[PDB]
Amino acid sequence: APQQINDIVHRTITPLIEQQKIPGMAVAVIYQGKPYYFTWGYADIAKKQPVTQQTLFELGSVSKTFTGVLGGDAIARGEIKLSDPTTKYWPELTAKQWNGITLLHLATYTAGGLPLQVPDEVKSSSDLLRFYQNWQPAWAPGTQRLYANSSIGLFGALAVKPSGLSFEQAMQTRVFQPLKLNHTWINVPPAEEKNYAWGYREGKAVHVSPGALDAEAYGVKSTIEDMARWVQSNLKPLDINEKTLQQGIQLAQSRYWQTGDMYQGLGWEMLDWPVNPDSIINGSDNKIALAARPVKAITPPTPAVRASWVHKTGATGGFGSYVAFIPEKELGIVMLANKNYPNPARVDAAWQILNALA
Amino acid sequence: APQQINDIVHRTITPLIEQQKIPGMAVAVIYQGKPYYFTWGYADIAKKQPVTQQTLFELGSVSKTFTGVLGGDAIARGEIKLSDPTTKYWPELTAKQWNGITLLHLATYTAGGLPLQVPDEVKSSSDLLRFYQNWQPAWAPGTQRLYANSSIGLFGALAVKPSGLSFEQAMQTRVFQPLKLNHTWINVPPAEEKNYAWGYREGKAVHVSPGALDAEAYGVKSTIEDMARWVQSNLKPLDINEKTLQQGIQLAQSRYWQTGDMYQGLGWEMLDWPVNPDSIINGSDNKIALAARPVKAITPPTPAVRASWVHKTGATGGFGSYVAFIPEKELGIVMLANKNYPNPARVDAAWQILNALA
Ligand SMILES: *[B]([O])([O])[C][N]C(=O)[C]C1=[C][C]=[C]S1
Ligand SMILES: *[B]([O])([O])[C][N]C(=O)[C]C1=[C][C]=[C]S1
């Protein structure tokens, strides 16, 4: 890798790893559209197993970007429309509060206050329907953005209904395979278990546990190499062979709502570039990222803006991830770690690196 | 051409020409992506000049499809956004009725009742400003569609302002040139006059008169070969090399509003395929097409649906044109005539032809 990239990555990431006590970490920098990889520490502390470019990390919420793109791909295929009511794809959801809540609202967290988490007690499909049927909105649809797994998680489950495929099979066949993400899984098979890193929470080795709509909201595991390819694919969608996937990636970066200097895409979040660092850094703190904020509809949505900082933070109990890229500069970065350390620390490191390279 | 296309075209067009007393006509059918041409009659009755594949016809309102795509291209380039207020590009438009009227409203005839025609007394740039400043909306923005040259015409003029280019130069550079429409003109050059058909109204030879916003709303002239190429480009935008143009074509086919079973795009109008023939035929009659109708917003707009009948009628005092295509079937038709004959007759003929071909 060029000396410029090695230098800024080393000086930025190693102190990060020490300050946050990160057991293992993998980083990819996409420079002029080419990937450069870096790895440090352990994937498994007890087994003294090193993090490699084949190590699988839990993406946590960065998984929502895959859900966003799969939904975009379903829209391009004519299977769904973001303007359609949620009830069109879930006829059993008859409760009166759902009138007016569309797939768009679900995908962008603007349904009116769906909760951050689907209660841990919701297991079966029966449980899930009862949960949504009993939910009462905090606000009217399309007025407030409240980041939620129960919102985009449902969008994902409904987005694939028309195809008749399971969420996992739709994702595998419509997204992971065309893009050749050969080491990306919602369910890690036995052959990859040896590469599945352990997450660490307060010293203990842990993996995300099953939960309702987990695959849809935070269930993807991937390597630093596949994630690099995922960034290249979102940086340059026209290079994608499959027509509906090309269009889906573009739709996932359209700006549907604005809150402050931030725009909500499908999974992805975007800001105009150049961006004010303190804004994305402080804005990533959960005290802000998880709070309700008023939204102004962008009518009609602005098509993917090349001069944008496009990003998504992600976390599970024992992992923390961050992805950011600027299409106009063919520049991007992926940071995967097996410890959920504070978001601001991730963005700060990412800004330092990408700002140095352009 | 295969005898099948030849037979359906001749069996449909021959009687049409006889019943409507059309002086000259050119038709192109795009079948499985290849064009087939047909011509009849005279481009100039007095000089006995026949209609040929090189004859230029006034497209009238089919010109709005070029304006829609040019606007879409400006959007893709990040020069304008459909959600921007009209005043962002025309600060001089300070009258309060303009608050809340966006470029989307202008492009889709939903600003609130802008008139079909710009008054003949309006010539000057200051005459135009005065006209829009004094105009009083009959309805709030985005509630009613009233087909209007003064609406999409203004959209076209404003869409090109950031580029710094004149509307004609932008059109030539960004649409005509990349697509190789080398015999399509906003102003017909002297070298091409020998191929410019005369329009006929009440037996008299006529050409379109200069008017405010004429280039933007109804001033393009073209040949049947160039129009078949235009249809091919709109049928398969993904084959277009120029990134923002491919995107612009797709944005022009997005569905922004719905009235009856018709959807409004940028210039183009669309219906779900299969269509009810009586619906597009009766719907083309000016008693419906030029009428004020409430519209339902498609929030967010549906990206170009492959299973659609996409079309546009067009007329000048002496010419009548029609273009229709079905992306999913790689099928299309262009009908150019030098007599403004009833819209329903055009659409009925087009339906018979395309339906017979699949
Ligand atoms: B996403 O933002 O990573 C989804 N976030 C959560 O589900 C909350 C967390 C739960 C455990 C770690 S972060
Ligand atoms: B377009 O629909 O051709 C614009 N129509 C007009 O400007 C009105 C006229 C229709 C025929 C001659 S002028």
XYZ file of C-alpha atoms and ligand atoms in Angstrom:
742
model
C 0.000 0.000 0.000
C 1.154 3.570 -0.642
C 3.215 5.030 2.181
C 0.632 7.845 2.623
C -2.143 5.364 3.410
C 0.005 3.188 5.706
C 1.145 6.280 7.602
C -2.232 7.896 8.302
C -3.903 4.541 9.071
C -1.165 3.410 11.484
C -0.979 6.694 13.419
C -4.756 6.912 13.634
C -5.852 3.334 14.324
C -3.151 2.010 16.694
C -3.725 4.705 19.357
C -7.468 4.034 18.911
C -6.957 0.332 19.607
C -4.908 1.169 22.735
C -7.258 3.870 24.048
C -10.335 1.671 23.655
C -8.661 -1.633 24.558
C -9.832 -3.285 21.329
C -8.898 -7.010 21.168
C -9.012 -7.287 17.413
C -9.603 -5.004 14.464
C -9.640 -4.964 10.668
C -9.676 -1.844 8.515
C -10.045 -1.366 4.737
C -9.335 1.928 2.954
C -10.622 2.277 -0.591
C -8.308 4.730 -2.356
C -8.937 5.693 -5.960
C -11.299 2.748 -5.923
C -8.652 0.166 -4.871
C -8.703 -1.589 -1.488
C -5.948 -1.548 1.139
C -6.212 -3.815 4.181
C -4.973 -3.701 7.753
C -5.398 -6.121 10.648
C -4.452 -6.108 14.337
C -4.982 -8.211 17.418
C -7.023 -11.288 18.106
C -10.284 -12.698 16.727
C -10.275 -15.121 19.669
C -8.298 -14.071 22.776
C -8.293 -17.469 24.550
C -7.134 -19.313 21.436
C -4.649 -16.525 20.562
C -6.186 -16.614 17.093
C -5.187 -13.568 14.999
C -7.574 -11.328 13.165
C -7.030 -11.956 9.427
C -8.666 -10.765 6.194
C -10.813 -13.906 6.396
C -12.104 -13.167 9.918
C -15.891 -12.648 10.141
C -17.138 -9.792 12.291
C -20.719 -9.033 13.371
C -21.695 -5.923 11.397
C -24.527 -5.041 13.748
C -26.535 -2.174 12.224
C -24.273 -1.785 9.203
C -26.471 -4.744 8.167
C -29.284 -2.165 7.606
C -27.371 -0.961 4.547
C -27.784 -4.438 3.021
C -31.462 -4.410 3.992
C -31.788 -0.974 2.363
C -30.174 -2.146 -0.873
C -32.224 -5.363 -1.018
C -35.336 -3.256 -0.579
C -34.103 -0.878 -3.285
C -33.521 -3.895 -5.560
C -37.099 -5.114 -4.878
C -38.431 -1.651 -5.788
C -36.422 -1.697 -9.083
C -37.892 -5.139 -9.837
C -41.410 -3.740 -9.473
C -42.130 -6.062 -6.548
C -42.816 -3.233 -4.053
C -43.216 0.562 -3.901
C -42.161 2.682 -0.923
C -45.447 4.545 -1.379
C -47.525 1.449 -0.608
C -49.182 0.966 2.781
C -47.566 -1.539 5.121
C -50.865 -3.439 5.102
C -50.542 -4.216 1.392
C -47.788 -6.721 2.236
C -49.113 -7.694 5.687
C -52.940 -7.941 5.308
C -53.292 -9.313 8.863
C -52.057 -5.974 10.255
C -55.561 -4.542 10.493
C -55.272 -2.238 13.545
C -56.446 1.334 12.818
C -53.158 3.033 13.756
C -51.477 1.538 10.689
C -53.447 3.550 8.172
C -51.073 5.887 6.464
C -47.888 4.072 7.521
C -46.073 3.146 4.285
C -43.019 1.054 3.501
C -41.130 4.329 3.203
C -41.922 5.192 6.864
C -40.720 1.756 8.030
C -37.499 1.914 6.028
C -36.590 5.396 7.303
C -37.671 5.199 10.963
C -40.503 7.668 10.459
C -43.519 5.482 11.221
C -44.252 7.427 14.405
C -42.135 5.936 17.137
C -41.663 2.200 16.592
C -39.241 1.139 19.390
C -35.464 0.788 19.204
C -35.809 -2.927 19.989
C -38.518 -5.551 19.375
C -39.092 -6.850 22.936
C -36.921 -9.894 23.766
C -40.130 -11.822 24.590
C -41.346 -11.656 20.994
C -40.337 -15.021 19.521
C -42.891 -16.547 17.116
C -44.691 -14.948 14.182
C -47.827 -14.819 16.345
C -45.899 -12.785 18.946
C -44.649 -10.425 16.274
C -48.067 -9.681 14.809
C -49.495 -9.057 18.275
C -46.621 -6.659 19.004
C -47.245 -4.539 15.879
C -51.045 -4.754 16.232
C -50.770 -3.419 19.816
C -48.197 -0.739 19.116
C -49.458 2.818 19.561
C -47.549 5.648 17.857
C -45.830 8.494 19.770
C -46.309 10.751 16.702
C -48.108 10.910 13.339
C -46.366 9.101 10.437
C -43.696 11.046 8.571
C -43.029 13.706 11.241
C -40.311 12.318 13.492
C -37.313 10.070 12.911
C -36.651 7.611 15.745
C -33.883 5.143 14.930
C -35.358 1.657 15.340
C -34.700 -2.013 14.648
C -38.406 -2.695 14.877
C -38.953 -0.263 11.952
C -36.375 -1.180 9.261
C -36.482 -4.772 10.523
C -40.161 -4.982 9.438
C -39.458 -3.157 6.156
C -36.943 -5.869 5.301
C -39.308 -8.732 6.142
C -42.111 -7.196 4.081
C -39.894 -6.086 1.157
C -39.190 -9.676 0.231
C -42.736 -11.066 0.582
C -43.669 -10.588 -3.098
C -40.579 -12.533 -4.305
C -41.746 -15.428 -2.191
C -38.134 -16.016 -1.030
C -37.052 -16.000 2.620
C -35.205 -12.841 3.678
C -31.966 -14.780 3.860
C -32.321 -16.386 0.399
C -33.370 -13.089 -1.205
C -30.294 -11.422 0.350
C -27.954 -14.219 -0.680
C -29.208 -14.461 -4.260
C -29.949 -10.823 -5.024
C -27.146 -9.080 -3.176
C -24.264 -11.163 -1.769
C -23.792 -13.380 -4.876
C -24.007 -10.818 -7.668
C -21.441 -8.728 -5.757
C -19.349 -11.800 -5.007
C -19.439 -11.316 -1.243
C -18.394 -14.957 -0.793
C -17.703 -14.713 2.951
C -20.754 -12.756 4.070
C -23.513 -14.547 5.992
C -26.684 -13.962 7.971
C -26.180 -17.518 9.401
C -22.471 -18.542 9.567
C -22.116 -22.100 8.213
C -19.942 -24.732 10.022
C -17.046 -24.336 7.528
C -16.704 -20.640 8.441
C -17.007 -21.068 12.201
C -13.198 -21.140 12.520
C -13.134 -17.587 11.085
C -16.035 -16.241 13.112
C -14.399 -13.902 15.617
C -15.678 -13.711 19.197
C -17.118 -10.381 20.340
C -15.979 -9.098 23.762
C -18.213 -7.428 26.322
C -16.722 -6.669 29.719
C -14.059 -9.345 29.198
C -16.460 -12.070 28.118
C -16.504 -13.750 24.702
C -19.930 -13.357 23.077
C -21.904 -13.692 19.837
C -25.153 -11.899 18.991
C -28.125 -13.969 20.116
C -31.173 -14.698 17.953
C -34.039 -12.256 18.163
C -37.062 -11.157 16.163
C -36.142 -9.558 12.829
C -32.504 -9.961 13.696
C -31.412 -10.889 10.172
C -33.216 -7.808 8.844
C -31.851 -5.279 11.336
C -28.487 -6.393 12.615
C -27.679 -9.938 11.599
C -25.009 -9.869 8.907
C -21.463 -11.164 9.557
C -18.735 -10.353 7.024
C -14.973 -10.103 6.429
C -12.892 -6.940 5.821
C -12.419 -8.008 2.182
C -16.169 -8.502 1.475
C -16.933 -5.226 3.235
C -14.334 -3.498 1.053
C -16.167 -4.898 -2.008
C -19.483 -3.729 -0.508
C -18.016 -0.185 -0.275
C -16.709 -0.320 -3.842
C -20.171 -1.386 -4.953
C -21.863 1.496 -3.236
C -19.193 3.986 -4.399
C -19.627 2.989 -8.005
C -22.982 1.313 -8.676
C -22.924 1.747 -12.481
C -20.196 -0.876 -12.540
C -22.669 -3.444 -11.325
C -23.799 -5.963 -13.956
C -27.304 -6.658 -12.533
C -29.665 -3.882 -13.577
C -32.051 -3.972 -10.584
C -29.173 -4.181 -8.062
C -27.483 -1.210 -9.731
C -30.738 0.728 -9.346
C -31.342 -0.572 -5.794
C -27.955 0.728 -4.576
C -28.758 4.091 -6.118
C -32.208 4.154 -4.445
C -30.652 3.299 -1.074
C -28.586 6.522 -1.323
C -31.490 8.762 -2.363
C -32.249 11.464 0.237
C -35.781 10.920 1.565
C -35.749 13.002 4.756
C -33.622 15.653 6.306
C -32.925 16.327 9.968
C -30.295 18.966 10.470
C -27.383 18.435 8.095
C -28.207 14.722 7.807
C -30.272 12.938 5.153
C -31.919 9.534 5.605
C -31.429 7.025 2.776
C -32.515 3.335 2.933
C -30.085 2.047 5.589
C -27.390 4.540 4.588
C -27.283 8.027 6.144
C -25.743 10.886 4.114
C -24.349 14.415 4.560
C -23.146 16.908 1.965
C -19.367 16.887 1.388
C -17.310 18.633 2.573
C -18.785 17.689 5.913
C -18.174 19.330 9.290
C -16.324 16.692 11.334
C -17.672 17.737 14.711
C -21.157 17.273 13.303
C -20.817 13.607 12.269
C -18.603 12.858 15.260
C -20.901 14.327 17.945
C -23.934 13.279 15.933
C -22.919 9.627 16.155
C -23.090 9.633 19.972
C -26.100 7.568 20.920
C -27.456 10.382 23.073
C -28.168 12.063 19.718
C -28.302 9.168 17.216
C -31.021 7.399 19.238
C -33.111 10.487 19.991
C -36.276 11.491 18.168
C -35.681 14.365 15.742
C -38.157 16.182 13.443
C -37.846 15.439 9.757
C -38.605 17.532 6.674
C -39.669 15.392 3.697
C -37.518 15.896 0.547
C -40.267 15.909 -2.078
C -39.420 14.168 -4.361
C -36.322 12.437 -2.992
C -32.961 13.705 -4.260
C -31.172 11.030 -6.335
C -27.846 9.825 -4.900
C -25.553 12.818 -4.499
C -21.949 12.159 -5.489
C -20.554 14.874 -3.234
C -21.772 13.222 -0.045
C -20.240 11.603 3.040
C -22.332 8.350 3.138
C -22.063 6.268 6.302
C -23.511 3.885 8.935
C -22.367 2.901 12.449
C -23.132 -0.599 13.715
C -22.902 -2.474 16.972
C -23.875 -5.701 18.717
C -23.092 -6.633 22.292
C -19.488 -7.482 21.495
C -18.679 -5.772 18.173
C -18.530 -2.238 16.761
C -18.390 -1.358 13.067
C -18.287 1.736 10.880
C -18.493 2.265 7.136
C -18.117 5.627 5.314
C -17.371 6.680 1.735
C -17.471 9.709 -0.568
C -18.503 8.695 -4.131
C -17.113 11.840 -5.736
C -13.615 10.972 -4.429
C -13.749 7.195 -4.979
C -12.756 7.074 -1.303
C -14.041 4.901 1.538
C -13.223 3.106 4.772
C -14.471 0.119 6.737
C -13.594 -0.386 10.418
C -14.538 -3.732 12.023
C -13.695 -4.474 15.673
C -14.633 -7.149 18.201
C -15.527 -4.691 20.965
C -18.419 -2.190 20.952
C -16.481 1.005 21.666
C -18.108 4.517 21.483
C -19.297 5.733 18.041
C -17.603 9.172 18.194
C -14.221 7.459 18.500
C -14.951 5.507 15.263
C -16.071 8.471 13.207
C -13.180 10.650 14.490
C -10.656 8.033 13.334
C -12.448 7.627 10.025
C -12.554 11.392 9.391
C -8.829 11.731 10.155
C -8.008 9.034 7.635
C -10.285 9.999 4.739
C -9.646 13.738 5.165
C -5.917 13.050 4.834
C -6.428 11.116 1.572
C -8.832 13.710 0.095
C -39.319 -5.555 -42.640
C -40.913 -8.873 -41.690
C -44.232 -9.221 -43.481
C -46.030 -9.223 -40.136
C -44.947 -5.712 -39.145
C -45.457 -4.552 -42.723
C -49.039 -5.871 -42.752
C -50.253 -4.525 -39.410
C -48.655 -1.113 -40.099
C -50.118 -0.811 -43.607
C -53.542 -2.155 -42.614
C -53.785 0.368 -39.785
C -52.170 3.466 -41.284
C -53.669 3.382 -44.782
C -57.259 3.823 -43.615
C -56.096 6.363 -40.993
C -54.563 8.564 -43.645
C -57.679 8.282 -45.811
C -60.155 9.002 -42.987
C -58.145 11.891 -41.468
C -57.036 13.288 -44.846
C -53.411 13.433 -43.680
C -51.086 14.920 -46.382
C -47.957 13.072 -45.318
C -46.927 10.666 -42.606
C -43.888 8.764 -41.348
C -44.018 5.841 -38.913
C -41.315 3.844 -37.118
C -41.972 0.633 -35.243
C -39.240 -0.559 -32.888
C -39.530 -4.357 -32.682
C -37.205 -6.391 -30.439
C -34.997 -3.300 -30.394
C -34.669 -2.722 -34.161
C -36.411 0.055 -36.127
C -38.575 -0.336 -39.223
C -39.684 2.690 -41.208
C -42.705 3.569 -43.279
C -43.653 6.707 -45.147
C -46.602 8.062 -47.062
C -47.554 11.118 -48.979
C -46.214 14.652 -49.083
C -43.965 16.810 -46.950
C -44.801 19.722 -49.326
C -47.967 19.487 -51.421
C -47.205 22.462 -53.730
C -43.650 21.409 -54.553
C -44.601 17.722 -54.649
C -41.910 16.763 -52.135
C -42.562 13.313 -50.655
C -42.189 12.348 -47.029
C -38.932 10.447 -46.617
C -36.946 9.083 -43.646
C -35.109 12.442 -43.680
C -38.178 14.712 -43.573
C -38.346 16.946 -40.479
C -41.708 17.209 -38.701
C -42.683 19.592 -35.879
C -42.992 17.403 -32.753
C -45.148 19.880 -30.875
C -45.572 18.652 -27.290
C -43.515 15.495 -27.820
C -40.766 18.119 -27.320
C -41.731 18.044 -23.605
C -40.195 14.536 -23.350
C -36.823 16.033 -24.339
C -37.310 18.848 -21.817
C -38.193 16.271 -19.143
C -35.082 14.216 -19.843
C -32.847 17.314 -20.015
C -34.254 18.363 -16.639
C -33.665 14.834 -15.343
C -30.099 15.088 -16.551
C -29.654 18.353 -14.635
C -30.958 16.628 -11.508
C -28.533 13.698 -11.955
C -25.721 16.227 -12.397
C -26.661 17.770 -9.034
C -27.380 21.161 -10.663
C -31.017 21.341 -9.527
C -33.409 19.321 -7.361
C -37.110 18.820 -8.056
C -37.751 19.707 -4.419
C -36.158 23.194 -4.735
C -38.481 26.223 -4.694
C -38.973 27.916 -8.091
C -37.586 31.075 -6.459
C -34.202 29.507 -5.884
C -33.596 29.823 -9.641
C -35.719 32.931 -10.195
C -35.214 35.158 -7.134
C -37.071 37.922 -8.989
C -40.264 35.905 -8.647
C -41.115 37.527 -5.327
C -44.935 37.301 -5.416
C -46.298 35.320 -2.416
C -48.352 32.816 -4.430
C -45.018 31.268 -5.402
C -44.124 30.241 -1.848
C -44.295 26.468 -1.883
C -44.293 25.974 -5.687
C -41.315 23.726 -6.511
C -39.613 22.699 -9.757
C -41.488 19.376 -9.417
C -44.797 21.244 -9.600
C -43.724 23.128 -12.732
C -42.435 20.031 -14.457
C -45.617 18.096 -13.751
C -48.338 20.733 -14.306
C -49.362 20.744 -10.634
C -48.329 24.306 -9.647
C -51.961 25.290 -9.167
C -53.406 26.230 -12.527
C -50.752 27.743 -14.766
C -52.408 28.170 -18.218
C -52.090 25.953 -21.254
C -50.698 28.839 -23.287
C -48.446 31.726 -22.466
C -50.335 34.833 -23.648
C -49.256 36.075 -27.117
C -48.457 39.502 -25.678
C -45.699 37.928 -23.609
C -42.431 38.217 -25.466
C -39.749 39.942 -23.422
C -37.873 38.405 -20.525
C -39.526 41.142 -18.421
C -42.896 40.342 -20.045
C -42.458 36.772 -18.838
C -41.497 37.827 -15.300
C -44.532 40.127 -15.152
C -46.804 37.349 -16.361
C -45.693 34.855 -13.688
C -45.706 37.539 -10.961
C -49.334 38.453 -11.772
C -50.576 34.888 -12.230
C -53.069 33.777 -9.536
C -53.290 30.028 -8.628
C -56.802 28.529 -8.672
C -55.479 25.771 -6.391
C -52.806 25.059 -3.786
C -49.575 23.448 -5.138
C -49.649 19.703 -5.723
C -53.398 19.203 -5.656
C -54.500 19.597 -9.233
C -53.014 18.821 -12.667
C -53.706 21.201 -15.545
C -51.623 20.390 -18.636
C -49.707 23.556 -19.545
C -46.948 24.935 -21.766
C -46.437 27.793 -19.278
C -45.662 25.222 -16.579
C -43.173 22.713 -18.028
C -41.862 25.490 -20.273
C -40.792 27.431 -17.173
C -39.352 24.247 -15.682
C -37.142 23.843 -18.753
C -35.835 27.404 -18.701
C -34.983 27.234 -15.013
C -33.557 23.718 -15.090
C -30.693 24.880 -17.314
C -29.754 28.059 -15.404
C -27.036 26.559 -13.211
C -25.317 25.095 -16.315
C -24.917 28.643 -17.664
C -25.887 27.264 -21.064
C -28.776 28.508 -23.161
C -31.638 25.967 -23.264
C -30.828 25.074 -26.921
C -27.140 24.625 -26.214
C -27.850 22.487 -23.165
C -30.276 20.330 -25.175
C -27.803 19.878 -28.048
C -24.799 19.186 -25.819
C -26.457 17.013 -23.194
C -29.200 15.153 -25.058
C -29.057 15.325 -28.895
C -25.244 14.878 -29.262
C -24.680 11.877 -26.909
C -27.704 10.126 -28.420
C -26.669 10.867 -32.030
C -29.870 12.713 -32.870
C -28.037 14.628 -35.562
C -31.175 15.729 -37.459
C -33.182 17.004 -34.475
C -33.365 20.758 -34.017
C -34.888 23.459 -31.913
C -34.113 25.911 -34.751
C -33.883 24.342 -38.246
C -30.662 25.387 -39.987
C -30.768 26.715 -43.575
C -28.911 23.598 -44.791
C -31.775 21.457 -43.544
C -34.698 23.549 -44.779
C -35.126 21.394 -47.889
C -36.212 18.552 -45.588
C -38.570 20.630 -43.397
C -42.121 19.537 -44.131
C -44.922 22.101 -44.251
C -47.712 21.613 -41.736
C -51.275 21.911 -43.081
C -54.180 23.581 -41.324
C -57.480 24.084 -43.140
C -55.599 23.431 -46.394
C -52.962 26.095 -45.767
C -49.198 25.402 -45.477
C -47.981 26.530 -42.067
C -44.980 26.287 -39.717
C -44.989 26.891 -35.959
C -44.752 30.611 -34.950
C -42.147 31.962 -32.484
C -43.513 32.162 -28.909
C -42.276 32.566 -25.338
C -40.962 29.288 -23.951
C -41.567 27.676 -27.336
C -38.278 25.679 -27.408
C -38.988 24.285 -23.943
C -42.634 23.306 -24.479
C -43.191 22.512 -28.157
C -40.386 23.573 -30.433
C -38.412 20.543 -31.443
C -38.412 19.284 -35.040
C -37.102 15.831 -35.940
C -36.972 13.021 -38.503
C -38.527 9.612 -38.143
C -35.039 8.017 -37.849
C -33.997 10.308 -34.997
C -37.319 9.756 -33.212
C -36.926 5.965 -33.466
C -33.478 6.461 -31.897
C -35.092 8.569 -29.159
C -37.599 5.776 -28.502
C -34.746 3.195 -28.399
C -32.873 5.359 -25.859
C -35.938 5.647 -23.647
C -36.608 1.910 -24.016
C -33.113 0.940 -22.788
C -31.510 3.801 -20.885
C -28.996 1.364 -19.444
C -27.276 1.158 -22.815
C -26.468 4.869 -22.690
C -22.792 5.566 -21.834
C -23.229 9.089 -20.391
C -24.068 8.473 -16.741
C -26.208 11.534 -15.978
C -28.218 11.112 -19.197
C -29.050 7.462 -18.426
C -30.204 8.645 -14.973
C -32.142 11.569 -16.432
C -34.066 9.312 -18.771
C -34.985 7.099 -15.799
C -36.065 10.084 -13.682
C -38.308 11.277 -16.521
C -40.122 7.909 -16.426
C -40.626 7.904 -12.654
C -44.266 8.223 -11.564
C -44.805 11.427 -9.566
C -48.582 11.805 -9.575
C -51.634 9.776 -10.465
C -54.886 10.919 -12.137
C -57.370 8.203 -13.125
C -55.155 5.373 -14.330
C -52.464 7.697 -15.719
C -49.162 8.575 -14.026
C -47.243 11.818 -14.639
C -43.470 11.632 -15.314
C -41.223 14.490 -16.531
C -42.720 15.046 -20.003
C -43.624 11.402 -20.476
C -46.957 10.079 -19.220
C -47.382 6.410 -18.245
C -49.995 3.659 -17.604
C -49.516 0.158 -16.266
C -49.203 -2.459 -19.017
C -51.377 -4.225 -20.051
C -53.499 -1.149 -20.521
C -57.163 -0.918 -21.276
C -57.097 0.409 -24.811
C -60.288 2.432 -24.345
C -58.543 4.034 -21.386
C -55.534 5.405 -23.283
C -57.578 6.139 -26.412
C -60.402 8.047 -24.712
C -57.869 9.475 -22.262
C -55.875 11.072 -25.147
C -58.836 13.144 -26.270
C -58.274 16.739 -25.257
C -61.621 16.766 -23.423
C -59.730 14.741 -20.777
C -56.009 15.403 -21.430
C -56.353 19.206 -21.201
C -58.853 19.151 -18.319
C -58.105 20.153 -14.696
C -58.053 16.993 -12.560
C -57.233 16.303 -8.892
C -53.998 14.342 -8.476
C -52.743 11.916 -5.883
C -49.062 12.280 -4.975
C -46.893 9.160 -5.295
C -44.838 9.489 -2.174
C -42.032 8.763 -2.907
C -42.119 8.568 -6.716
C -42.085 5.082 -8.267
C -38.928 4.505 -10.296
C -39.499 3.699 -13.982
C -41.704 0.601 -14.225
C -40.710 -1.696 -17.116
C -44.323 -2.925 -17.402
C -45.776 0.401 -18.535
C -47.197 1.956 -21.696
C -45.137 5.194 -21.805
C -46.320 7.846 -24.276
C -46.857 11.465 -25.331
C -49.037 13.136 -27.909
C -47.980 16.341 -29.596
C -49.389 18.981 -31.867
C -48.704 22.265 -33.563
C -51.117 24.148 -35.776
C -50.137 22.033 -38.760
C -48.660 18.831 -37.267
C -49.757 15.849 -35.149
C -47.276 13.461 -33.511
C -47.422 10.457 -31.162
C -44.784 8.333 -29.431
C -45.499 5.198 -27.297
C -43.311 2.379 -26.003
C -43.427 -0.606 -23.657
C -39.999 -1.209 -22.050
C -40.773 -4.754 -20.900
C -41.551 -5.776 -24.498
C -38.792 -3.742 -26.219
C -41.575 -2.429 -28.417
C -42.326 1.114 -29.553
C -43.873 3.308 -32.216
C -43.496 6.845 -33.556
C -46.144 8.485 -35.779
C -45.384 11.914 -37.304
C -47.876 13.655 -39.588
C -48.160 17.092 -41.127
C -51.775 17.646 -40.061
C -52.977 18.013 -36.440
C -55.627 15.240 -36.487
C -57.586 13.912 -33.436
C -55.495 12.341 -30.625
C -57.787 9.309 -30.178
C -57.277 8.335 -33.805
C -53.492 8.362 -33.205
C -53.583 6.269 -30.079
C -56.138 3.802 -31.485
C -53.819 3.203 -34.456
C -50.763 2.877 -32.230
C -52.617 0.411 -29.952
C -53.701 -1.778 -32.855
C -50.113 -1.946 -34.089
C -48.290 -2.609 -30.836
C -50.911 -4.974 -29.484
C -50.648 -7.070 -32.658
C -46.881 -7.274 -32.174
C -47.315 -8.566 -28.558
B -27.562 -1.007 15.302
O -27.501 0.446 15.521
O -26.213 -1.592 15.559
C -28.647 -1.667 16.244
N -28.386 -1.274 17.654
C -28.890 -1.979 18.679
O -29.597 -2.980 18.486
C -28.572 -1.553 20.095
C -27.484 -2.261 20.598
C -27.708 -3.426 21.285
C -26.495 -4.001 21.631
C -25.420 -3.242 21.175
S -25.859 -1.798 20.318
B -48.705 20.197 -26.958
O -49.754 19.364 -26.321
O -48.651 19.927 -28.453
C -48.994 21.700 -26.690
N -50.308 22.114 -27.244
C -50.508 23.408 -27.600
O -49.596 24.253 -27.490
C -51.864 23.836 -28.169
C -51.968 23.564 -29.534
C -52.390 22.328 -29.939
C -52.395 22.271 -31.315
C -51.972 23.470 -31.884
S -51.554 24.712 -30.742
